[PDB]
Design a protein around this nucleic acid. Structure first.
Ligand code: MG
Ligand code: MG
Ligand code: MG
Ligand code: MG
Ligand code: MG
Ligand code: MG
Ligand code: MG
Ligand code: MG
Ligand code: MG
Ligand code: MG
Ligand code: MG
Ligand code: MG
Ligand code: MG
Ligand code: MG
Ligand code: MG
Ligand code: MG
Ligand code: MG
Ligand code: MG
Ligand code: MG
Ligand code: MG
Ligand code: MG
Ligand code: MG
Ligand code: MG
Ligand code: MG
Ligand code: MG
Ligand code: MG
Ligand code: MG
Ligand code: MG
Ligand code: MG
Ligand code: MG
Ligand code: MG
Ligand code: MG
Ligand code: MG
Ligand code: MG
Ligand code: MG
Ligand code: MG
Ligand code: MG
Ligand code: MG
Ligand code: MG
Ligand code: MG
Ligand code: MG
Ligand code: MG
Ligand code: MG
Ligand code: MG
Ligand code: MG
Ligand code: MG
Ligand code: MG
Ligand code: MG
Ligand code: MG
Ligand code: MG
Ligand code: MG
Ligand code: MG
Ligand code: MG
Ligand code: MG
Ligand code: MG
Ligand code: MG
Ligand code: MG
Ligand code: MG
Ligand code: MG
Ligand code: MG
Ligand code: MG
Ligand code: MG
Ligand code: MG
Ligand code: MG
Ligand code: MG
Ligand code: MG
Ligand code: MG
Ligand code: MG
Ligand code: MG
Ligand code: MG
Ligand code: MG
Ligand code: MG
Ligand code: MG
Ligand code: MG
Ligand code: MG
Ligand code: MG
Ligand code: MG
Ligand code: MG
Ligand code: MG
Ligand code: MG
Ligand code: MG
Ligand code: MG
Ligand code: MG
Ligand code: MG
Ligand code: MG
Ligand code: MG
Ligand code: MG
Ligand code: MG
Ligand code: MG
Ligand code: MG
Ligand code: MG
Ligand code: MG
Ligand code: MG
Ligand code: MG
Ligand code: MG
Ligand code: MG
Ligand code: MG
Ligand code: MG
Ligand code: MG
Ligand code: MG
Ligand code: MG
Ligand code: MG
Ligand code: MG
Ligand code: MG
Ligand code: MG
Ligand code: MG
Ligand code: MG
Ligand code: MG
Ligand code: MG
Ligand code: MG
Ligand code: MG
Ligand code: MG
Ligand code: MG
Ligand code: MG
Ligand code: MG
Ligand code: MG
Ligand code: MG
Ligand code: MG
Ligand code: MG
Ligand code: MG
Lengths: 131, 134
RNA sequence: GGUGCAUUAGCUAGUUGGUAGGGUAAUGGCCUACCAAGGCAACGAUGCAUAGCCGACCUGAGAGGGUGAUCGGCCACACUGGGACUGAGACACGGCCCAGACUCCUACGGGAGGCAGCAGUAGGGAAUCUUCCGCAAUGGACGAAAGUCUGACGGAGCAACGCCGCGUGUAUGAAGAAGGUUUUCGGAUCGUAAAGUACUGUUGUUAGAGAAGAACAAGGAUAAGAGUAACUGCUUGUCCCUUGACGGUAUCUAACCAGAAAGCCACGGCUAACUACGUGCCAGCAGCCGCGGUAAUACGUAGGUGGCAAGCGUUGUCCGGAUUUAUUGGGCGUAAAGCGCGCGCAGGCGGUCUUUUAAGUCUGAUGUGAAAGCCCCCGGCUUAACCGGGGAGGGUCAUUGGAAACUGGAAGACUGGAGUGCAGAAGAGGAGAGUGGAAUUCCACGUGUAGCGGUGAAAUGCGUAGAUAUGUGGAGGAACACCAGUGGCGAAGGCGACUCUCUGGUCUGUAACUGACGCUGAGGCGCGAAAGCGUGGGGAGCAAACAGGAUUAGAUACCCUGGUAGUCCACGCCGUAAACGAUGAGUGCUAAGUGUUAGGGGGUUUCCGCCCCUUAGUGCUGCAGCUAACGCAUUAAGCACUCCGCCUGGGGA
RNA sequence: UCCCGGGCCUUGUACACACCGCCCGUCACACCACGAGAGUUUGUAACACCCGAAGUCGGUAGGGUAACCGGAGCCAGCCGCCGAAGGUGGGACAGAUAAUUGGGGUGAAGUCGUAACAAGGUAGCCGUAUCGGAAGGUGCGGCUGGAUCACCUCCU
RNA sequence: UAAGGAACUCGGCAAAAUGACCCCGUAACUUCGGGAGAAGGGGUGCUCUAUUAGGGUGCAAGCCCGAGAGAGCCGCAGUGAAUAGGCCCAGGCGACUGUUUAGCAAAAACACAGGUCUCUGCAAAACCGUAAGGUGACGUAUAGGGGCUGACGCCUGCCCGGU
């Protein structure tokens, strides 16, 4: 059965990148909103829209490629799996690809990236690595 | 395996095996029981001196000894160098080292430490074979 | 919070709790009488084995792995067992009593002992030091104080055992001394190293000067205080005097001497460094690959070279390389590795939204994590080692204050998961009872004459007691011709003649209903081809064992003629297979092309038929992706998450 | 069509010194480790009874006795519980040893056959039953990890 | 009957030893019932607390039954007499309980439950009798007669020339 809806978000984007698909849509959730919204802030995804329906709504994401078809996202990874959750202190927040990537952290002040977390001295659950 | 599987029974590593069992064993005469202490050399009195032939394709005649160690274990040693002076009922010092050609020989007799004397007319590599400066 | 074994499953009876009392510095089954039958354990009790614990040490990029000697903290022990006295403190290392083993003295009645204190002796061992000098400094016990005691402690002695420092000489000097070693005999190398000239004394030898470690205490004068009727006396301050085992030690300056001071291992590759002679699978070498059989860069010796140097090699033990137990950081189609399959307790994991809580999570303050050690910054020893001062780090730690995104708890809400309802469909799914037709065998009777059967060839065998063939009838048992199809059904094994009875599951359509009711699942419980086992039947064909005939050098085989258990049925066991897709179960995503099974929708058409779309199965071909390759590829061996099983060189096995 | 030598293509291979290849098992000899064995012998931790020193505690005390008011109290002696060592008994566990025996491993040259690798000369393998000097043969069910020999079906 | 304790003897033959009740504890092996009273140990008398605590009987009077304890007392000895299992280790034979030579042999012999072969379709075969008449049987192949083997477990091989 479905045991990790966040992992599906991470892997659906990865599966669409390989075949250069220009868009995708998937069932919506509150936590997926920030993750999808965060990616738009650093240009990892070209756009995002919400569709309201009966069950839970629907979200579609517009993937982004450079001129002459280079991927903008070269990898997505899930860290804190349901089988082994991980937590990071204020000084333990990593730097994905030596600052050229980002990490999504679910702090007590909201879901925000690794760079912003070290500016507020808070920790939380590390959710994903995007580079 | 999965983390839960890896918690119910953790990972057990392999155990190495020593190649010189007799060197790392002791004896207590009061209790007649072997004690477990490591040791770089052991001494004993040899009970038989002779030769056998190595495995194929070598064809020489290798000079060995049969020593009874101080802790009461009967082992087979090997005399290096050209010519020796060993006889039955002689006290010698053995040390670790296996010879490949010989099937059962697992130890080396050190030369120049006890009743066994150094090699005659050795000019170089003299620290081995126990020959003093000429 | 820190160890191995499940090839160690139960353990316990003052044990578990209660009531009254005793005892202790103090609570308490600590002890006693009564009452009840409890307590612990698969989150590993009990038992066996091993072990003092920690700060720390070695290694490692780190996470970890191994260790617990020296220095510091705690514990236990004092020849082996037991007991108590004295005391603030002991069940007491150089105290007592009893028992035991051992040594010694006895006048035979009896007595005396305990180095795991500092030295030292014997023994064991591959292996570890002097039967030294002082209380001068520090700290102890007693004393009012000098002072006494202190094998604590300061020093000295032995051992290259380790770390650190630098001495065995510097500069100039030949196309190049002699002599080794090689040479296609000209030369090359040792070698600027010799020899020569000039210079230095760290070290050496001799002789002269000679520290710090010393603060003291006590004793003598004073001064000021508290207390005094007054002193003596007490507290603080300043002057005078006094004490060194090391030891004439460290350290300076005076002179003479290149003179007394370099070894160890390797040179085929890994791995820096190659030529001669001797030997001839011999002697021998070796960590692995492997070298040696009359031209060995690998054996032995020389010359030369290369690594280090007061050293250098070998052995033993630990970590690394080893991702070779993989949390960081591996895997299971064919290399080791998916249980034969299901039903499921415990456990692990879990769709969407709102409010609240604050266990997990993040953050601030306080207390603490000793000293020494690693690390950072300064300073002293002529430098270093070494020694001081300050700091840092080190915790799933305790008290307390915050945050609410995520996991958890509580209260509600929803329908994409799951299940029920309603309308259809297909199927060798299972158990029981009965029936059918071909064909083989046997039996009875007509017809009929000499062979039949069998093989690569034959023979055994059957037949004139009349076979084989043929026509008619009877008895009995087992399997179900065509249909039949990478077709169907089932969890797997497996299920194929027909009818009826009793039963399980699945697919499609609808959106009425409940509202997360789910997935996996160690132990447990069931099913499970064939052969095999027990009891009672049945027995037509087939056929292990067995018999005969051939083949063959032999033929305990293949081939031929016969043939018993078995194969069949009822009940009860057994529990295995190349039980295989050599591929665990659940879920989602990711080009297409084309057959086929069971359904649904739409367009053409009167139907039929053709086409398109869609759900669940079943085959083939192929992109991205994966793979060591073969190959897999929407029925993944691709991309991901959850749970279970299993693997860590071969043989032994 | 066969026998010999050779040339191309394809198929299978456990062969590469290349089929004059490779390789399995019994038997004879020698050595090594392990299990069983009528027995023998060392050791560990307990348990149940018998006996029970020292000692603390409890009871008496007829013998001895300065402090306190002959009295009290105290002490010796005796008695009771608990109790180390010792003795007896049946079990548990661990090691060593033993006539003989069972499979296993090593040894280039010994004897017997040739089971597997090619269609290995009867395709091989898996479970099971029986038989045979030995590799192994045969029956029943299963697999392809089979080149094979014929009509049909799907893909290119 | 001192000391010894099988040295006697074909052989521990005979004798000696254990012996009741209550409590603790108990091995190999096993057909799971056993072995087992395994083995090996401990306690018993009298007085007081005491017509006990508590039970049976009765309407009550009363009568009967009698565990645990404590304190004591006496003997060399407390089921103080008589009566009352000795036990263990290993092997052969027979599975077991049973039967046998009145008057020499009680056993390893016979029997047995079980196995197998064979005969018998009923006026059955088999047996007694010259026959009638009977047993078998007021039975009917899951029944009846005869031969051999003898619980149970694993098995039962080759030969049909001779009789
Ligand atoms: Mg050498
Ligand atoms: Mg603990
Ligand atoms: Mg109390
Ligand atoms: Mg207690
Ligand atoms: Mg324990
Ligand atoms: Mg590493
Ligand atoms: Mg560490
Ligand atoms: Mg020491
Ligand atoms: Mg001692
Ligand atoms: Mg006291
Ligand atoms: Mg003591
Ligand atoms: Mg003392
Ligand atoms: Mg003590
Ligand atoms: Mg002391
Ligand atoms: Mg002493
Ligand atoms: Mg004594
Ligand atoms: Mg000493
Ligand atoms: Mg000594
Ligand atoms: Mg010695
Ligand atoms: Mg002093
Ligand atoms: Mg002092
Ligand atoms: Mg004083
Ligand atoms: Mg003294
Ligand atoms: Mg002294
Ligand atoms: Mg000292
Ligand atoms: Mg030194
Ligand atoms: Mg040395
Ligand atoms: Mg010369
Ligand atoms: Mg020359
Ligand atoms: Mg000098
Ligand atoms: Mg001088
Ligand atoms: Mg001087
Ligand atoms: Mg002083
Ligand atoms: Mg003074
Ligand atoms: Mg004064
Ligand atoms: Mg004054
Ligand atoms: Mg003063
Ligand atoms: Mg002087
Ligand atoms: Mg000077
Ligand atoms: Mg000079
Ligand atoms: Mg090199
Ligand atoms: Mg040569
Ligand atoms: Mg070499
Ligand atoms: Mg050489
Ligand atoms: Mg040389
Ligand atoms: Mg050199
Ligand atoms: Mg040095
Ligand atoms: Mg060294
Ligand atoms: Mg080493
Ligand atoms: Mg590792
Ligand atoms: Mg691997
Ligand atoms: Mg898998
Ligand atoms: Mg294989
Ligand atoms: Mg495999
Ligand atoms: Mg499977
Ligand atoms: Mg559950
Ligand atoms: Mg959730
Ligand atoms: Mg939960
Ligand atoms: Mg510290
Ligand atoms: Mg400095
Ligand atoms: Mg320091
Ligand atoms: Mg410091
Ligand atoms: Mg919230
Ligand atoms: Mg709140
Ligand atoms: Mg539904
Ligand atoms: Mg059916
Ligand atoms: Mg059926
Ligand atoms: Mg018919
Ligand atoms: Mg012929
Ligand atoms: Mg006929
Ligand atoms: Mg199915
Ligand atoms: Mg049904
Ligand atoms: Mg049905
Ligand atoms: Mg179906
Ligand atoms: Mg509703
Ligand atoms: Mg399930
Ligand atoms: Mg199970
Ligand atoms: Mg069967
Ligand atoms: Mg049967
Ligand atoms: Mg039968
Ligand atoms: Mg034959
Ligand atoms: Mg036949
Ligand atoms: Mg059956
Ligand atoms: Mg098996
Ligand atoms: Mg299996
Ligand atoms: Mg199958
Ligand atoms: Mg398998
Ligand atoms: Mg899967
Ligand atoms: Mg799937
Ligand atoms: Mg399909
Ligand atoms: Mg191995
Ligand atoms: Mg192994
Ligand atoms: Mg040609
Ligand atoms: Mg090869
Ligand atoms: Mg063959
Ligand atoms: Mg046969
Ligand atoms: Mg077959
Ligand atoms: Mg094949
Ligand atoms: Mg007598
Ligand atoms: Mg007597
Ligand atoms: Mg006696
Ligand atoms: Mg006797
Ligand atoms: Mg006699
Ligand atoms: Mg006799
Ligand atoms: Mg008698
Ligand atoms: Mg009463
Ligand atoms: Mg009596
Ligand atoms: Mg009696
Ligand atoms: Mg009998
Ligand atoms: Mg008689
Ligand atoms: Mg009659
Ligand atoms: Mg008659
Ligand atoms: Mg009659
Ligand atoms: Mg019958
Ligand atoms: Mg029988
Ligand atoms: Mg008989
Ligand atoms: Mg039987
Ligand atoms: Mg017979
Ligand atoms: Mg006959
Ligand atoms: Mg005949």
């Amino acid at each position: 059965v479905m045991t990790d809806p966040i992992a599906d978000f991470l892997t659906r984007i990865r599966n669409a990148n390989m075949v250069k698909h220009d868009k995708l849509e998937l069932p919506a959730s509150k936590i997926k909103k920030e993750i999808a919204e965060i990616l738009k802030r650093e240009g990892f995804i070209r756009d995002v829209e919400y569709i309201e329906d009966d069950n839970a709504g629907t979200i579609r994401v517009f993937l982004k490629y450079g001129a002459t078809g280079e991927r903008v996202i070269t990898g997505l990874k899930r860290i804190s799996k349901p089988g082994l959750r991980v937590y990071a202190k204020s000084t333990e927040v990593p730097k994905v690809l030596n600052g050229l990537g980002i990490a999504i952290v679910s702090t007590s002040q909201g879901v925000l990236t690794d760079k912003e977390a070290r500016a507020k001295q808070v920790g939380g659950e590390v959710l994903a690595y995007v580079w | 395996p999965t983390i839960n599987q890896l918690v119910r029974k953790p990972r057990q590593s392999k155990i190495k095996k020593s190649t010189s069992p007799a060197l790392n064993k002791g004896l207590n005469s009061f209790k007649r029981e072997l004690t477990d202490v490591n040791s770089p050399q052991k001494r004993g009195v040899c009970t038989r001196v002779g030769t056998m032939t190595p495995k194929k394709p070598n064809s020489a005649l290798r000079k060995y000894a049969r020593v009874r160690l101080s802790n009461g274990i009967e082992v087979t040693a090997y005399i290096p160098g050209i010519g020796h002076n060993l006889q039955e009922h002689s006290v010698v010092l053995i040390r670790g080292g296996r010879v490949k050609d010989l099937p059962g020989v697992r130890y080396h007799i050190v030369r120049g430490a006890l009743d066994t004397a150094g090699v005659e007319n050795r000019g170089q590599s003299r620290s081995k074979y126990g020959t003093k400066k000429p």
